Symmetry: D2
Subunit: 315 residues, 4 copies
């Protein structure tokens, strides 16, 4: 069962004026209901797979090798012909196109990181308004997706689909009961603002929903980001663990078409230098960071809603 | 003169609930008139100078050495006692405090890079509103400042003061030109009446009256956010003929809005996108970047306003 | 099948004067036979797992929660007590120790990236020699390892063991036959020096070999790096694909106790600006646009056996 | 007196088989006496200056603008024609060539960061030897240089020349006391950037390699002094590194330093059985220059503790 694949990474693709994403589900946690797609940009990574690639390694035979530069061209050209509005839709489109073109391949995997842009405010004769010409390149959180399509008995299918928002970094300016033993740090505890990094991902029950053909069924990463921020703001969390459980429940509650929500976190909380948070001064800690990995599923939500003592609440 | 200084860098200092910056000058290019300072954070770098530091190098004599760790403590404790609202004000406060404490120092230099946070929107029972609890760590543009103070016979004086906004990254999809340049055997670049323009801007300014940067009269304090908004507004409105042309007009506009400034300076970078599918689809270019250094002064603005040939316009 | 773990990352741990690794297998591709371990340093990442952690998430109950800071202390203290000489040995030692201490855990995973130091040459009254005092922090290739241990009904077992060398970046200052279609770039090809990034990993048939208790059976990442460089130097490769197959075969040949070698590559080859006047003499190159070729591949002992049984094999070793 | 320049950065330029640098001065701190230049690569950054560039900013008039893309082409082509062996020589050559081509320029500034490669050992039928074909891209310390050339009534002159080695990171597995104690008071690992200046700037061109100071030699001096000296601080250490460099290379007028203190925190006290970890981010730093006058004074002073191999 050998590992075998090859492809091209850092395939930057910037499509201008892609079809707008409109008609997303209205939720209390967010005002985000459309994504204009004036810039539809990403960093794409494609990998090709198939048993027929073996001799390209074992014999240096390039006869069945699609050149990696050609894969780059293929992706960039398909960005021009794509008529949809979502990252997942674009990746599925491209995967399927590779398989239609190259019969000797059996699977194609696309991973993408959004090359994100913010709308900005500019002063005009009409007052201060949102620019339709100039955008800020954002180095903050960005949308992610992965689609892998493989051949099936009848054609092809998505065998892996991931959607997410990466690099959310939030601090709240307003934890006890752990195991205590010989490994516990012998120093007094101080209160600091909880500072967290979150990567949040989700999975669809019907993967076609990720294509955005019916945007009422598409989950925009920006909505998930807004849910996470809203829950962080409102909940009196007992821990990051407890917080992400409630963020996940809320996402599943707003989007019943999702089967699960997953998290990867960092705790990045500052160290106290001067105790206050009025008048307080903090600084960066030593490098070690706490982290959590956790998935929440519809079964968890159904259990909470059926429970007599659940603490789960939603707007 | 010998080079000689020492200090502490990466002195992260995060003060919570500093005095709010309020009452900034209203300008057409911006709606930014206050900075709440719920988090007032920065990465500071301090350097001490003085002829009396020589033997710490030449003889390893630490007698007159303030430990760099002690400098860190000094800065962090002063972050708690500072009652002002601006980066420049804090830096000058600390410089003067070091000089008051340590008579053997001739000069103290503080540099700072803002540790920036964005306000975010959260869903509540009252609808979607700005959170006063949760903030996003921004990896986008950030405020900068430098203050160096030297001892004098009568007391102390500011020998350098700098203010800026760093790492503005903006794209303008279309409208910018680059043609008319030298065509010789080294020229392979095709002239363009319309090419995508991606700019990186660092903008700085100097005050005629340095105490203005302290923010004690905020009507005379120039917030970096206002400068950023002017830059974006000019980028939006001007049909630029190069980044050189663009930054001249940005500089003029800043000087126009803030007559109390003597100069605006630019350290800027430029990178077009390569076209891969003509309309469009673009991709990242090879590494080389254009760059520019330029300063604009009130004399330039006066010249432009009085000239029958000027193309300078302002809201 | 829920995802559920928590831990501490960027646990930098720098042990001085760990037991030296001595007595490695001599091979033609390498002079590396000992690693003195004057500095035995790494960036460690620990994850704790167990069904009993569930209510820490679902109820905010910290009762069975080992504090992440405590995990950091645990690792750092075990770095002082570890008597072995290998990264894999240390990671397994720590995993097992966590499980012995905390009965409510089902599994513990440790990952580590070496915090690498080079020996350097210094002038002294005896001439230019290797310093035993001063070392360069290296930002080049570095050793990697992962060990995950889980509880069983009758003790514990290793459920994952990984060993590797990361971030080898090599150029050779010395490819055709691809599919050609409408997606082919319509430009003439030029010859450039092949420039590759390699991450190489391996697995042991007998996992205890990784502990280094018999160093003759321990595969040092530095030896693997030296094999890779040597094969790159000698082989007339037909592609990166072809190259890594042969690097893998050679590693398997030298170390029969390995079951597989795996690769992750980048093609980082430059673009031509000025064609050389003769070979690469007088040539000038520059960095390409960002897109990079990559390959993922594993080579197994069965591959080596096939090559040795084949009349048409091109495989050769020193 | 406004600021005004423009140019191109991240101009990666990789020349293969440049003229080897051979015949460097033998010194006790180093075995480095030649640099083969099989790869002669750098990241170059060029800036052009000239009063006649004003209207390119003020009027958007590109008539006298050399496109930054063209500057890139200019540098890369001159890498093919350069026949010397040093970074400084290449930069001066390019600066002079820009000024010869474009009369309306007043000054040209080139900065470069070496794109460094290490020689490596490979096993062959002749045993383990240094490869002549395969090299490792080094992410460790690298050579730097800056040359800026401006016009004179009779031709051109160098108005700035800099040479250095950047990002040396060294730990010593083997003091700091006596500092001020007041209310603010509560395994040495150093980062070094070292630069130097020549009395006769033409020595940087390498036409007489006995007078060329290779950054690798300076690196070897720094390491050797770090190894041998019992330092009382990083400040004290860099003074002695600087004195030593000036001693070996009398043709240098000065050596300058930019440092970091990156020393670890102790977690388990030993250094047998000792365990350390990374500290919080704040780092000490120093800036300092040492001059030939300092060395002459040390070499005549009974108070001096300076020693060299």
């Amino acid at each position: 069962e050998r590992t075998m694949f090859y492809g091209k990474g850092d395939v930057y693709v910037f499509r201008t004026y892609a079809n707008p994403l409109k008609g997303l589900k209205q939720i209390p946690e967010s005002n985000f209901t459309e994504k204009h797609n004036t810039i539809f940009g990403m960093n794409a990574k494609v990998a090709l797979k198939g048993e027929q690639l073996l001799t390209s390694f074992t014999e240096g035979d390039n006869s069945l090798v699609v050149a990696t530069d050609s894969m780059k061209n293929f992706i960039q050209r398909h960005a021009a012909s794509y008529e949809g509005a979502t990252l997942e839709g674009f990746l599925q489109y491209v995967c399927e196109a590779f398989l239609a073109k190259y019969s000797h391949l059996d699977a194609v995997r696309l991973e993408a990181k959004e090359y994100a842009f913010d709308d900005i405010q500019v002063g005009t004769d009409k007052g201060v308004v949102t620019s339709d010409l100039v955008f800020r390149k954002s180095r903050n959180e960005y949308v992610t997706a992965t689609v892998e399509v493989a051949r099936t008995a009848s054609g092809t299918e998505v065998v892996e689909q991931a959607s997410g928002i990466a690099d959310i970094q939030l601090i709240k300016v307003s934890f006890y009961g752990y195991i205590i033993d010989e490994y516990t740090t012998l120093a007094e505890a101080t209160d600091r603002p909880l500072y967290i990094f979150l990567n949040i991902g989700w999975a669809y029950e019907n993967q076609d929903d990720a294509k955005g053909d019916n945007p009422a069924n598409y989950v925009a990463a920006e909505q998930v980001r807004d849910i996470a921020a809203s829950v962080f703001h409102t909940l009196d969390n007992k821990s990051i663990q407890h917080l992400i459980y409630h963020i996940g429940l809320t996402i599943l509650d707003r989007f019943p078409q999702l089967t699960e929500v997953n998290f990867g976190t960092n705790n990045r909380t500052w160290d106290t230098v001067v105790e206050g948070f009025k008048g307080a001064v903090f600084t960066e800690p030593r490098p070690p960071f706490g982290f959590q990995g956790f998935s929440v599923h519809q079964e968890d939500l159904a259990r909470e809603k059926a429970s007599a003592n659940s603490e789960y609440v939603a707007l």
